[PDB]
Amino acid sequence: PKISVAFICLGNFCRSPMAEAIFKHEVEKANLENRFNKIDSFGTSNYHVGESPDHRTVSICKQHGVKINHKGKQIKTKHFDEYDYIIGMDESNINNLKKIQPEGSKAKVCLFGDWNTNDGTVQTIIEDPWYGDIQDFEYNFKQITYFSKQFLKKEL
């Protein structure tokens, strides 16, 4: 009846925590909270488990008035039966997810950008901003906001 969504990136450090925060935020804005059960973010690696997000991810969120509070956690096979949508940021995320995904598990694995439009507003792939600069985080924010809206528009 209610749906559960998980966002995934490589280290659950720069991108997916941002996707989770922005998505929770848009759901609020639109009064769709009743339609959701769980909204989380995980990383495929365990390198930043227990850590708070990249300070640039937090700064950008704060800059747009988006609340963010998260500690890194790693996706586990059990999660494939707990979420309706497991959303990756780039193709390498998707490759790893499809490999660990139990056959017959419930989760639909997709690229956040599968909800992108065919018009050039934003690039489809949400690129890793770690080696980039604050400008890359700002663009990730713009991308995620846009796909969050398309998702709410087309999936409910």
UniProtKB/Swiss-Prot annotation:
SMART domains: LMWPc (SM00226)
Intracellular or extracellular location(s): Cytoplasm
GO CC terms in record: cytoplasm; nucleus
InterPro entries: LMW_PTPase, Ptyr_pPase, Ptyr_pPase_sf, Tyr_phospatase_low_mol_wt
GO MF terms held by the record: acid phosphatase activity; protein tyrosine phosphatase activity
Keyword Hydrolase in record: yes
Enzyme class (EC, first level): hydrolase
Phosphoserine modified-residue sites: S52
Residues at the catalytic site: C9 (nucleophile), R15 (transition state stabilizer), D128 (proton donor)
Site (Important for catalytic activity): S16
Keywords tagged on the record: Cytoplasm, Hydrolase, Phosphoprotein, Protein phosphatase
Entry function: Acts on tyrosine phosphorylated proteins, low-MW aryl phosphates and natural and synthetic acyl phosphates.
Misc. remarks from the entry: Present with 3500 molecules/cell in log phase SD medium.
This protein's name: Low molecular weight phosphotyrosine protein phosphatase
Organism: Saccharomyces cerevisiae (strain ATCC 204508 / S288c) (Baker's yeast)
Gene coding for it: LTP1
